[PDB]
Design a protein around this ligand. Structure first.
Ligand code: AGS
Ligand code: AGS
Ligand code: GDP
Ligand code: MG
Ligand code: MG
Lengths: 353, 330, 96, 332, 257, 258
DNA sequence: TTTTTT
DNA sequence: TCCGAGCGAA
DNA sequence: TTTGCCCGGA
């Protein structure tokens, strides 16, 4: 679409522009795709995993994979409650995010996916006999968000119907993927681009958009502030250009998102005042962040690594902080009410300082 | 059933048919048999661990009371049946308050696996049990008393089925050997009894597997080697070798020894942990802190193993736990 | 329930009482004898057997042409909120 | 042939094709003659041959034509609540066994019972498992149950007692190299000496993973189109193993002990996407088999690695857990 | 096949099955050369149904050797519904069978519909439960018994039958009150079907659960008269006569509290 | 510009109800020849095709072809609002954002006007080439529908097999199996009830029961149904109209065993 | 959707 | 167009 | 000492 992060997204394996060895591996997979195993792409956020999944699908099935439409599918729970799932589809593949339905994601696996596996499909645009002569492809986004029951429901579908269906699962971490599912997948590591690769991409955008640029070093700064997140770097470039009248300067500052600013303020507060009253104000800040769709795990990660950057703390404080972060990150994984665990972490940190 | 009883698993082929074939529960059997003899049958509760003879005993009692046609004269319900409040109020209450169809006599209701019933159904049962006592008697069977309400427990005469002692298992094994034309060495019998934890089902299943594992069961003899082979379990010698290496050798040699012993027969780590815990329980330790550290760390490792994890890291954890705990022994 | 309330007591909100009429028919100048005081006791006891009842009672408290007295034990309960602005609240405390 | 991923293409067809589970396969093979198959509980780690074994056994027992009428397979993809167990499973267990044809009776043992396979039974609720208990016993005459699981502690004790236990062992270079080499030869994959054993070492007990790794390596070699051998470095790259140089860098940063340096190095390291579990495994191997560290250090680090691996098993943030582990090692 | 039994019209068998469907779930049919007998017992084990169909109910019948077919009544009724009341219905079974074949064939066309219902391994004896000399034997039209039962069931969950010399008394006592119907024997040579017959040696007084009687009266669709046999120590027998055989309900009385 | 008046609105209502459960949004390509529509279902296991002819309409004219994208739910609601006895008229202009529906009754007193907003549906082009099917059969729709309803009660899948003078519908399930065997039969006195079969190769295929249940709803349109089956094609179910037809291309279930 | 009391 | 039931489901 | 969203219905 119109935003630069979308306008210039590559549409084929030939148009990819970072991590050349991974590109070669993907081309090798797409060379003879009839016995392609199920795939699991993993790597840090915003590096190009979905871009590469779409490029691989294009290499296998042609450009038609980018002609997408959305459709609403209905389901009913045992309690008779109605649920809807948005499904993205091309003529050659489906894309689902079962975690959209929360703990009911299992239903999506047990009914929708299974059905796709058991049926043949018609095709009156590529097949001479009206039937599609190819396996069906299903992309499962945010696969590490599936509950253990849904992941279990995948196991035998992947084996029994391998003739008719192939799965591509995408995740930012494999830690929550159960061992049987990883056993069934070809695991593809997708590393972040280097800062030079990011600078080259950003420079290409700067040229195609006629943005005035005092020095190339600016791009490097952006590349460094994005910590390998290419989506973040492209969006930051656009925002900086918009705020500097499409003319970036060496003095032009890096724009941080609102939630990051709030979290940094919270870090300064925790460091300055360790007391019960301060903890109550912190609870208010945490509720504000959570209510506006900042996930608890993101808050914990950002707060931990903001604290560890504070110059005034000593090694003992920092080691205590990282231990507490580990403990309460596990707590967040095992529990429901996030504010409880975030408050516990902040309280222990205040005690340690 | 289909074809002969020789097609059945040994755990079902050797199910007791009469009270005289129930072993290792003599006090209970005597009491209940004389209850029947004198015509004084109270409401019964059979409480005990798996495979100790509860269902066998109650079915044998019904067979003795009512003869061969018992199955049409009792109401038997278990966890495979719905037993909600509605079932209690309709099916159970109707059977309790009505005469027999086939032969005159009192009614028997058997609630097997009663720990599977909800609190509301159990409470509905209270006055059904009390009101129709003149003509009906209830028998409740359970592995877990805590899911039974205090009011239901009060109304039943309790009988605890013990883990089967050594002598009873030995006699049952002798019967099985005679019937199967099997031979069993003394050490093999000791190993079998040790691994069964007083559960007859385990004994019979292992024995059937051992017979299947022989080349010629007519001449071949089941030795402890066969038992360990079919169970995929560590020999006592392996356990002692591993423990000695952990307690007396350097880290490289202990790691090597654990890995080599495990690789020898593809032993599981949890089995080694169980065996070593059993061995260490008999140790005399100067410091209580040694026992504390050993137990807590090994329980943590067992719990982590139950969820999967990295086997190599868990083995190293076991080695380190034992060494660090015995450091306290000075 | 809303159905029973609408089919029953509703018709008495603006109706004379036949019992009241015939009790004090002989009595001269008895103005109140023919009118109702509607007492709805134990409002806090209206469970699932009275779906829609509390809202309908609040409606009546706004649209009644005869005096209505409601009684409850737990005034601060959430389900008693609809009555807030439409009733004259009289608190009874523990006597000494 | 050319349409199957290799894991499904080379699934064992009969009991003699299962490679390293003789202790259990022998017992099962004897029932082709004894015809008194017990209730079975297969348990073990992923990709060791449990599902393959039960399928091959049913084929050997009933032949291709009569199998379908003699089997009820229910797995984690199917609804298996207490109502299902009390109605569908019970009803199937109650039925008379399908009549075998004369040809079937000539060519197969045809035992007088049917089989219910509850694959992935450790995902069933405790109450549904309880509902199975008396169904298993009352209808043993005409039905035998096979429960399959990875976590045996998830099966309630009464059911474990009813079942005959078969533990499937981990598959490693010692006991699965023959099968892997057979597959490699069938597919014409050229490898240096050591490569197949390295694959099985990396797989860490899982033959499905080893076969998939072999297929990925052969795809790479065919795409390269140079006729060279697959190397161990290539296999390790495909398997997401951290290069030895990177691991040495981590070890030296830990040795230095400067918190900020470790933090910055870990932040850079995470950008490569290395799986934290593989990193922890490699650190365990490096430290526990190192003659330069003494007994107290190794005791402490063994507990540290155990704790971090356990926390990672719960689905935690890999960056946080890895940094905590490295800081703690550095302060030993 | 070994067993072949053809109903001229499937409606006969459907009505017979519907005559006792609501009381029991699992039914065991034994087919022999002289016809088909069946038994079933209700879930609470308080009611037993016994059916007899003779060879005369069938257009054609053949049973080379005795055979036992156990099945669930809901599945059987579901299948019976899939066929048309007008088609000819042939029950077919083979030796040592795993299923029963229901073959719906209409002569007008060449359309065959063959259903196979898998059978259960229901091993249970029938015991031929019937006491020799019942205390009281009575018979009356089915509509009147249905009416009495339906009226008295609105009052109580239990109904008492008292037989004394030349009098039959139904009684029900409940929360809102009680009801009592007394009938006397009577022969009407103009309309024998309305007759009420009563023979009795010992007077009887027995109580029964109302819901069971409400199920039992559903047999009235299969016969104009119902026979009732009662004894102090035995289940009560309610018999409805078919053109060829019979439908019997054996209902155990309540324990005298 | 474009106007199409039907002899009776009941025909149009029945046609719409025929395939409204399978698909909801559809484009009608009104042309001088007639109305032609083609839709794929969301799961892509089913294609519905409509070829209402000019003779079907009482009167019809549309000089320049026009594509009208509409949702079938709103059209069904509007048709329900109409009376049984009416001459439904569809009216549209050169560039219509909506279509006008006139329910002109026989009595001039009753006149009703409705407006249905159109839609812009991105529908691609489908090339449905004629194929030499392995077998063709024709039979009454009441019989086929009754077979489907009876067999669906036994299983989730129904198998259709054709061999030499034998058409077999089978369903296997938990409680058992059901099978119907029809044979080629001709009745001169009542030709409409005949069963016709052209057999080139033996065929066996399996279909989801829910899909056949959806399909049989078109039985009202035509007293007879044609079924064409091939080993590699979708199964073709045709209900003939006065001059057009309602057509269903159904994909079979994936044969895991073979 | 609800564990226990003395 | 206005109103808040009943549930915590991000 | 009782929140926020906002049902089904008018
Ligand atoms: N005391 C016993 N004497 C002889 N055989 C026994 C005995 N206990 C168990 N068994 C054997 O193990 C099998 C199971 O016995 P059961 O009586 O059904 O066990 P249980 O006590 O009911 O176990 P739970 O509580 O249902 S897990 C029997 O068929 C016998 O073969
Ligand atoms: N013992 C084995 N012998 C031969 N191949 C095996 C063996 N074990 C695993 N495999 C191979 O890996 C694939 C998976 O085997 P499975 O039997 O499905 O493993 P599994 O034990 O059922 O794994 P889980 O518990 O579902 S993760 C097989 O198709 C084989 O190709
Ligand atoms: N020029 C160029 N841009 C890329 C490449 N890979 C990713 N991007 C850009 O980075 C954006 C984020 O990529 P994405 O696949 O959504 O990240 P992920 O799925 O979270 O890993 C995309 O919208 C693209 O614009 C690449 O190889 N070349
Ligand atoms: Mg028992
Ligand atoms: Mg498996």
């Amino acid at each position: 679409m119109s935003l630069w992060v979308d306008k210039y997204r590559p549409k084929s394996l030939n148009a990819l522009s970072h991590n050349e060895e991974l590109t070669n591996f993907l081309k090798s997979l797409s060379d003879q795709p009839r016995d392609l195993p199920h795939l699991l792409l993993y790597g840090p956020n915003g590096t190009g995993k979905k871009t590469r999944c779409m490029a691989l699908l294009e290499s296998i099935f042609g450009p038609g994979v980018y002609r997408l439409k959305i459709d609403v599918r209905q389901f009913v729970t045992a309690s008779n409650r109605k649920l809807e799932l948005n499904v993205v589809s091309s003529p050659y593949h489906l894309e689902i995010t079962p975690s959209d339905m929360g703990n009911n994601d299992r239903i999506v696996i047990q009914e929708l996916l299974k059905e796709v596996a058991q049926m043949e499909q018609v095709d009156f645009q590529d097949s001479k006999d009206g039937l599609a002569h190819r396996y069906k492809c299903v992309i499962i986004n945010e696969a590490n968000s599936l509950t253990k029951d849904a992941q279990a429901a995948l196991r035998r579908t992947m084996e029994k119907y391998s003739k008719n269906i192939r799965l591509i699962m995408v995740c930012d971490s494999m830690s929550p993927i159960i061992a049987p599912i990883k056993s069934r997948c070809l695991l593809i590591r997708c590393p972040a681009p280097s800062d030079s690769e990011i600078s080259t991409i950003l420079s290409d955008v700067v040229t195609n958009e006629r943005i005035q640029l005092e020095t190339k070093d600016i791009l490097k700064r952006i590349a460094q502030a994005s910590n390998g997140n290419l989506r973040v770097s492209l969006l930051m470039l656009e925002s900086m250009a918009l705020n500097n009248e499409l003319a970036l300067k060496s003095s032009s500052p890096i724009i941080k998102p609102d939630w990051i600013i709030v979290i940094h303020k919270l870090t300064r507060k925790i460091v300055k005042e360790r007391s019960v009253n301060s903890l109550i104000e912190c609870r208010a800040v945490l509720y504000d962040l959570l209510a506006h769709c900042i996930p608890a795990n993101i808050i914990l990660k950002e707060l931990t690594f903001s604290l560890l950057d504070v110059e005034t703390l000593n090694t003992t404080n920092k080691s205590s902080i990282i231990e507490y972060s580990s403990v309460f990150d596990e707590r967040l994984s095992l529990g429901n009410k996030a504010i409880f665990h975030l408050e516990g972490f902040i309280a222990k940190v205040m005690c340690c300082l | 059933e289909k074809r002969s009883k020789e097609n059945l698993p040994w755990v079902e082929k050797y199910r007791p048919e009469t009270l005289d074939e129930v072993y290792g529960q003599n006090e209970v059997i005597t009491t209940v048999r004389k209850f029947v003899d004198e015509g004084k049958l109270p409401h019964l509760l059979f409480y005990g661990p798996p495979g100790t003879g509860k269902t066998s005993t109650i079915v044998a009692l019904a067979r003795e009371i009512y003869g061969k046609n018992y199955s049409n004269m009792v109401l038997e319900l278990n966890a495979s049946d719905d037993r909600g409040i509605d079932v209690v109020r309709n099916q159970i209450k109707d059977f309790a308050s009505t005469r027999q169809i086939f032969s005159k006599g009192f009614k028997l209701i058997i609630l097997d696996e009663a720990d599977a019933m909800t609190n509301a159904a159990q409470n509905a049962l209270r006055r059904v049990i009390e009101r129709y006592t003149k003509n009906t008697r209830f028998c409740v069977l359970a592995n877990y008393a805590h899911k039974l309400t205090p009011a239901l427990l009060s109304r039943c005469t309790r009988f605890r089925f013990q883990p089967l002692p050594q002598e009873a298992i030995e006699r049952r094994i002798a019967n099985v050997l005679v019937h199967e034309k099997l031979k069993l060495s003394p050490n093999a019998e000791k190993a079998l009894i040790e691994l069964s934890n007083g559960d007859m089902r385990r004994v019979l299943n292992v024995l059937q597997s051992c017979k299947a594992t022989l080349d010629n069961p007519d001449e071949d003899e089941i030795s402890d080697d066969v038992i360990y082979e079919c169970c995929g379990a560590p020999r006592p010698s392996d356990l002692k070798a591993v423990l000695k290496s952990i307690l007396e050798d350097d880290w490289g040699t202990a790691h090597y020894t654990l890995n080599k012993v495990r690789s020898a027969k593809g032993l599981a780590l949890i089995d080694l942990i169980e065996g070593i815990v059993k061995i260490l329980e008999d140790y005399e330790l100067q410091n209580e802190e040694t026992r504390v550290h050993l137990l807590t760390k090994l329980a943590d490792i067992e719990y982590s193993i139950s969820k999967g994890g990295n086997d190599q890291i868990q083995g190293s954890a076991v080695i380190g736990a034992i060494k660090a705990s015995f450091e306290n022994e000075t | 329930s809303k159905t029973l309330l609408n089919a029953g007591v509703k018709n008495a909100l603006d109706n004379m009482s036949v019992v009241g009429y015939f009790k004090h028919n002989e009595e001269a100048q008895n103005l109140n004898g023919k009118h109702f005081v509607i007492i709805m006791d134990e409002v806090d006891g209206m469970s699932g057997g009275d779906r829609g009842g509390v809202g309908q009672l609040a409606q009546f408290c706004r649209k009644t042409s005869t005096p209505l007295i409601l009684i409850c034990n737990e005034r601060n309960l959430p389900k008693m909120r609809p009555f807030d602005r439409v009733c004259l609240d009289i608190q009874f405390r523990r006597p000494d | 042939l050319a349409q199957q991923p290799w894991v499904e293409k080379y699934r064992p067809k009969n009991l003699d094709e299962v490679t390293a589970q003789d202790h259990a396969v022998t017992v099962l093979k004897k029932t082709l003659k004894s015809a008194n198959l017990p209730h079975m509980l297969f348990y073990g780690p992923p990709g060791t041959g449990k599902t393959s074994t039960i399928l091959a056994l049913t084929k050997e027992l009933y032949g291709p034509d009569l199998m379908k009428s003699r089997i009820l397979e229910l797995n984690a993809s199917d609804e298996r609540g207490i109502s299902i167990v009390r109605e569908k499973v019970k009803n199937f267990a109650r039925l008379t066994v399908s009549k075998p044809s004369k040809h079937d009776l000539e060519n197969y043992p045809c035992p007088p019972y049917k089989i219910i396979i509850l694959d992935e039974a450790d995902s069933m609720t405790a109450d549904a498992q309880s509902a199975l208990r008396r169904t298993m016993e009352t209808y043993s005459g005409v039905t035998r149950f096979c429960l399959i699981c990875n976590y045996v502690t998830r099966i309630i004790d009464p059911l474990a007692s009813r079942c005959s236990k078969f533990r499937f062992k981990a598959l490693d270079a010692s006991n699965a190299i023959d099968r892997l080499r057979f597959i490699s030869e069938q597919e014409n994959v050229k490898c240096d000496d050591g490569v197949l054993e390295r694959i099985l070492d990396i797989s860490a007990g899982d033959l499905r993973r080893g076969i998939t790794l072999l297929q990925s390596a052969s795809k790479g070699a065919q795409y390269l189109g140079d006729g060279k051998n697959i190397t161990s470095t290539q296999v390790e790259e495909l398997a997401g193993v951290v290069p030895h140089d990177i691991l040495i860098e981590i070890v030296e940063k830990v040795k230095s002990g400067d918190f900020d340096e470790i933090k910055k190095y870990v932040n850079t390291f995470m950008k490569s996407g290395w799986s934290a579990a593989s990193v922890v495994n490699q650190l365990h191997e490096y430290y526990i088999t190192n003659d330069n560290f003494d007994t107290n250090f190794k005791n402490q680090i063994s507990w540290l690695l155990f704790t971090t691996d356990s926390r990672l098993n719960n689905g935690t943030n890999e960056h946080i857990q890895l940094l905590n582990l490295l800081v703690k090692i550095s302060q030993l | 096949s070994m067993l072949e039994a053809k109903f001229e019209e499937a409606s006969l068998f459907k009505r017979i099955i519907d005559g006792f469907k609501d009381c029991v779930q699992l039914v065991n049919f034994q087919c022999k050369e002289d016809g088909i007998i069946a038994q079933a017992v209700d879930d609470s084990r308080v009611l037993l149904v016994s059916l007899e169909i003779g060879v005369e109910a069938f257009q054609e019948y053949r049973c080379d050797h005795p055979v036992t077919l156990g099945m669930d009544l809901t599945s059987l009724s579901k299948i019976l519904r899939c066929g048309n009341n007008t088609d000819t219905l042939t029950l077919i079974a083979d030796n040592t069978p795993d299923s029963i074949i229901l073959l719906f064939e209409d002569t007008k066309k060449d359309r065959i519909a063959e259903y196979s219902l898998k059978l259960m391994d229901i091993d249970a004896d029938f015991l031929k439960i019937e006491e020799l000399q019942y205390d009281s034997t009575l018979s009356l039209p089915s509509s009147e018994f249905s009416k009495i039962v339906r009226d008295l069931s609105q009052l109580s969950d239990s109904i008492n039958i008292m037989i004394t010399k030349e009098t039959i008394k139904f009684v029900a006592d409940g929360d809102i009150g009680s009801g009592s119907v007394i009938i006397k024997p009577f022969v009407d040579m103009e309309h024998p079907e309305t007759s009420i017959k009563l023979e009795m040696d010992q007077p009887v007084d027995l109580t029964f659960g109302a819901k069971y009687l409400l199920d039992i009266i559903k047999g009235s669709s299969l016969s104009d008269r119902v026979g009732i046999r009662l004894s102090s120590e035995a289940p009560a027998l309610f018999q409805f006569d078919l053109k060829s055989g019979f439908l019997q309900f054996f209902l155990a009385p309540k324990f005298n509290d």
